[PDB]
């Protein structure tokens, strides 16, 4: 996944 997608997965739980 792209870095932007990894961030999107970060803010899903935070």
């Amino acid at each position, epitope marked *: 996944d*792209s*870095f*932007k997608e990894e961030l999107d997965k*970060y*803010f899903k739980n935070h």
Partner: antibody
Amino acid sequence: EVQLVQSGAEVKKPGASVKVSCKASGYTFTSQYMHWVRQAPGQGLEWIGIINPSGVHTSYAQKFQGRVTLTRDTSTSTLYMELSSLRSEDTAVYYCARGSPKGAFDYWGQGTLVTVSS
Amino acid sequence: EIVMMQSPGTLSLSPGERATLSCRASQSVRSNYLAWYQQKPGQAPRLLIYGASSRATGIPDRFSGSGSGTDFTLTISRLEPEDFAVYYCQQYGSSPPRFTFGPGTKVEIKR
């Protein structure tokens, strides 16, 4: 050409608050995360925080937690950086940078100098 | 946090020569997410290299990055007078979001 355009320089008394803006029109910007980086005169670059495309999610550096507020206006494609309780060490050129979908900051604004002087 | 180091502090070379800039990280940089930025006087930083070795759009082939883990290198072959600037290295991570810069290396051009 798509380009980040920041607001003009402001001089603020100590303890006052400052609000810097960054115009980020175009899909290249409105579909990506945006960052704020400051640079004290004669010093390196310091990351302030990051804001998501919708403007709902933010993450601030440990140093600026509780003092900075990142907001984003999607109807005008405008980003904002508010820093409260300005002290002398906050005097810096505040940059607004685009977070590439790959990670690095590939688009930068021209910068905004904030002078905290009595 | 991940502390970034750079060496040398100042580098002074002639046009056509090769400049070698070092960047050391306190931890291993996940996914080799290492970026190099060029900042000329009175200008904003400019992305030269991301992902340790990827040239950004518009960057000439003479700019080159390498390394993995904690040690990274930026090499500027065929130096030109326009290359006078300060060069910062930066790590970036996504989970959790982390962005820390190096102290910078001032590159001066002799003539």
